[PDB]
Ligand binder design. Structure first.
Ligand code: G4P
Ligand code: G4P
Lengths: 562, 562
């Protein structure tokens, strides 16, 4: 059972000719476009299973495939005999060397009259070498292939059985331990409207029963298990129990994640592996409980938000979601802020109403000291805006690297700064430069702490105390103590922010009780996200953005004290 | 002599009150705004010298100050008693902790009626702590200060002698070796119209005589020495010989560089230290020997180019220049390509005529394997231009990190690629996207090799064979075999490129002998630089850009064979 299994992954390009093979290969199945993940070719002339996971030619985002070939121990790279190798395979293959197994080349479309076998074999070598190995040698691989089912190999018997061999000879079964505690890391992931969350992966240690307690790793939660199932033909069928080394799937746990892990409960722990897919930012997703409880849009009862969040986790790799104590709340994490602000803005137009907390970083503990994540920052501002921007960032732990003046009168700057400290300067490096704040930046890596808090705002806010439209009567008078997000006539409610206060402390005012008034500010989504403190939320609807305190009345604000 | 010296550096901000102190401090000098680098306060009630190097409040580019405080062992930070600490000192000071000595706080303007001594001392602590230390403690420092020459310290005798002490107590003399072979690394740098190149730095080992042979390090050259001089008052005066630990200056060697080194010739070698100021790119600067030998501009005879190159090396820190075998040629290196293309474009408008070779990288040998430099690349292109840009970079060793789609229909991409391989895609990622090729990128660090050559072009070129204007007679006929940088009527010469050829091989054609002609391409400076091969040069004048082969006639091209 253990030495039988052969875990591999297919790769093909615009020459749509994958299976094709598998389809015809099915010379076993139930003897008596398109999918999937995966397909068994359990065959003989031993009854060896052969799990075959499709590696997508379409590059998803944040690198899906890293996870795919972490399962398998070898690969199948199909190529056209007339065309030759192609650029869409370069992304996959270049990632199948460093990690990393024996490959198997498959020269298809030989049955074509327009075809070039000797030339393609030679064309492979030169583009295949540039990717090191550094073996091959064999690299065998170097088969014929005919979907339609001569010269070179063989030729030519049952253009099928010969291949079988190719896999079983050169691809080995995974070095994994049958016995001991159960252990598995979840490589792939998917979802269904009723069924819930789904697993998929190889099996590192032990075995699994349908009803069998387990524990989640990276954090602590240890929810139960219910139903389990494996793979046969183009289908996923149920199973009572199975051992090891099997690309078999699973349901009824948690939320669960890509690069997550879950083993037994005794004599185990833990599971590492990042590899470079870990998230860096956390924020909450809780349902809108404010005075527009399902007014402006359509989707509200936390049931469906979960679905909407889950369904993204199928083809969004760089994303993690987590369950909470209070069930109308979910912590959603990702590769960045604009990786999370995309999710939010997409849901607005679909017609959602909900609220999200402020982005705190993921200080992922890397070896002794509690490391946090940093970004390589690029600025292009005018020379008069340098002395300001140097000051504003030198206060957020702004270590400068290589400023480079560019003749013009315009100057370039290259900072590196902690993610935690880079929350807020997206508003200010625009407010300073006055439109000409050419700036966006990339993630670098995990570095030490600042340390201590650094990305905190000064100011308080001008808070309301009732429902109604803002008036000349109030707004022209309130706006002397700092600025405004709103203007003449706008339905507000108790617990909202209409604007900024000129000092650090906050205020509760009434807006209902020579104007001539100052327009308001354009606070967009991500600007609202970066803005809020550790006691404020961002109310988002399909129509406009409004910001609120977590507690509505002035006295409910005074309640928060421990 | 050795335990006497005290090497320190001043720091002050908009409160222009440096010296001020020094000026009045001169209580020795020759007893019987502005400068400089540096000033001695050789005094007593031992005759201890005190070299004082000004650290500029103006941030230069590529970090000048790293080098400044590499000389000194402590610092003097002057501050206003009324105002307090300021943002321009944040850049300097934050770099005086990690490397790194005892500081000395100086509370000036106490004599002002508007002044706040107790408050400033307290204001220091909080902004001074955020920069770790992690001592202080003392941190003493904490003196009075009156230019005009009470409460707190002292007070108050000769508001001058007390200070002297402050330096001599807490600042130590440098741990350096009097004896053995001579050794020194050149921290600062400057130039004069006749005199030549100048040194400046501390003294690590040994001593120096005026006429005394020596050797340069990082490479091999071992040119002679002629004249040497030290510091007394606001002046640099000559000296017969001096030992160790002395911020003393020097002339008549080489070219010479910042972060360069030069020791004896026996029992020595070598000098390290980068620290992060090393260059990454090399290109040549040779005089224009082509058929516009001093036509369109004014400056040509290699004498003055050297001056122009040298004078930049005073306040351009991220730059290195080197001498050659053929004296009408100089290798100029820097922190990048656009750090070097700025120098070039500036010289054009001044009225220079010269030529430069193609940028090859600086594969600086970092530990065993010959490492080369890499860049964090950022792309913002439209979704239809992704599949192209992935192919074009996957061929230049384009390892993708974190692609991030942004809802719109526009997509973001974050590559990392070897500098060597990123030469050329600045033309192509514009030629693909068709104006919308939002791209510039930052240096990352030194990584392994590709390896092997990767940033080489395919095509040959359409080369001329005589002087005259391009005609309908030729150009409409030549342009069938690839494209053109020029059009109807343009004075050319033998050995120039007018355009591209459709295959990899080159061609020699005549342009003098239904048109209707295709306009030409706009080949700018940096586009011309990235374009040329390892046997082509870029001719730059104050008027327009033209590109040529290194050898003029077709037969002179056939000459290059070994
Ligand atoms: N001559 C030849 N062609 C091959 C071979 N393998 C695949 N093809 C071609 O590929 C197309 C389908 O792509 P495949 O890659 O085979 O589909 P698959 O993902 O399900 O394997 C077919 O085009 P189609 O017929 O237009 O599509 P359909 O009508 O089959 O749907 C078929 O002609 C081969 O060995 N020889
Ligand atoms: N009250 C007071 N002022 C101080 C003190 N130290 C410096 N200053 C002021 O600083 C200005 C000059 O800047 P400094 O920093 O002293 O010049 P420096 O670089 O040569 O030392 C002077 O202004 P100025 O007089 O307008 O310039 P000038 O007429 O002297 O050129 C002077 O009034 C101090 O201890 N007390």
């Amino acid at each position: 059972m253990i030495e039988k299994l052969r875990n591999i992954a297919i790769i093909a390009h615009v020459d749509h000719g994958k299976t094709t093979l598998v389809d015809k290969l099915l010379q076993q199945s139930g003897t008596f476009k398109e999918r999937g993940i995966t397909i068994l070719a359990k065959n003989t002339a031993n009854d060896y299973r052969i799990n075959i996971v499709d590696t997508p030619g379409h590059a998803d985002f944040g690198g899906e495939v890293e996870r795919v070939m972490s399962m398998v121990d070898s690969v199948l790279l199909v190529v056209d005999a007339f065309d030759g190798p192609m650029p869409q395979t370069r992304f996959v293959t270049k990632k199948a060397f460093a990690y990393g197994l024996k490959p198997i080349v498959v020269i298809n479309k030989v049955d074509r009259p327009g075809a070039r076998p000797d030339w393609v074999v030679d064309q492979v070598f030169d583009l295949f070498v540039n990717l090191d190995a550094t073996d091959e040698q064999l690299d065998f691989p170097i088969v014929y292939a005919s979907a339609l089912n001569g010269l070179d190999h063989e030729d030519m018997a049952e253009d099928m059985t010969p291949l079988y061999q190719a896999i079983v000879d050169h691809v080995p079964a995974p070095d994994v331990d049958l016995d001991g505690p159960f252990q598995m890391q979840i490589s792939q992931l998917d979802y269904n409207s009723y069924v819930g969350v789904i697993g998929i992966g190889r099996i590192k240690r032990g075995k699994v029963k349908p009803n069998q307690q387990v524990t989640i790793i990276d954090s602590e939660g240890k929810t139960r298990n219910a139903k389990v199932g494996k793979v046969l033909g183009h289908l996923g069928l149920e199973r009572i129990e199975t051992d090891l080394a099997e690309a078999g799937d699973i349901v009824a746990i948690t939320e669960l994640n890509i690069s997550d892990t879950v083993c037994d409960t005794q004599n185990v722990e833990a599971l590492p592996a990042l590899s470079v897919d870990e998230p860096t930012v956390s924020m909450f997703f809780c349902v809108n409980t404010s005075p527009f409880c399902g007014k402006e849009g359509k989707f509200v009862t936390s049931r469906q938000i979960l679905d909407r969040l889950n369904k993204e986790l199928v083809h969004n790799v760089a994303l993690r979601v987590e369950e909470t104590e209070d069930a109308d709340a979910f912590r959603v994490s990702g590769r960045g802020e604009l990786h999370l602000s995309v999710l939010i803005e997409n849901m607005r137009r679909e017609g959602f109403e909900l609220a999200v907390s402020r982005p705190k970083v993921i200080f992922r503990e890397i070896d002794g000291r509690k490391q946090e994540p940093y970004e390589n920052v690029t600025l292009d501002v005018e020379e008069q805006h340098q002395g300001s921007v140097m000051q504003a960032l030198g206060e957020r732990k702004g270590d400068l690297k290589n400023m480079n003046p560019d003749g013009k009168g315009r100057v370039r700057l290259d900072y590196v700064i902690p993610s935690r400290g880079l929350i807020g300067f997206r508003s200010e490096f625009m407010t300073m430069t006055s439109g000409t704040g050419l700036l966006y930046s990339t993630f670098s890596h995990y570095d030490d702490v600042r340390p201590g808090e650094v990305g905190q705002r000064q100011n308080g806010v001008l808070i309301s105390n009732g429902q109604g439209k803002a008036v000349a009567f109030a707004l022209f008078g309130l706006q002397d103590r700092g600025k405004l997000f709103l203007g003449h006539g706008a339905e507000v409610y108790e617990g909202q922010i209409i604007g900024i206060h000129s000092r650090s402390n906050d205020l509760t005012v009434n807006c209902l009780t020579a104007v001539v008034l100052v327009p308001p500010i354009r606070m967009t989504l991500e600007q609202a996200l970066e803005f809020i403190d550790d006691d404020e939320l961002v109310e988002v609807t399909p129509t406009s953005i409004r910001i609120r305190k977590r507690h509505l009345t002035e006295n409910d604000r005074r309640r928060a004290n421990r």
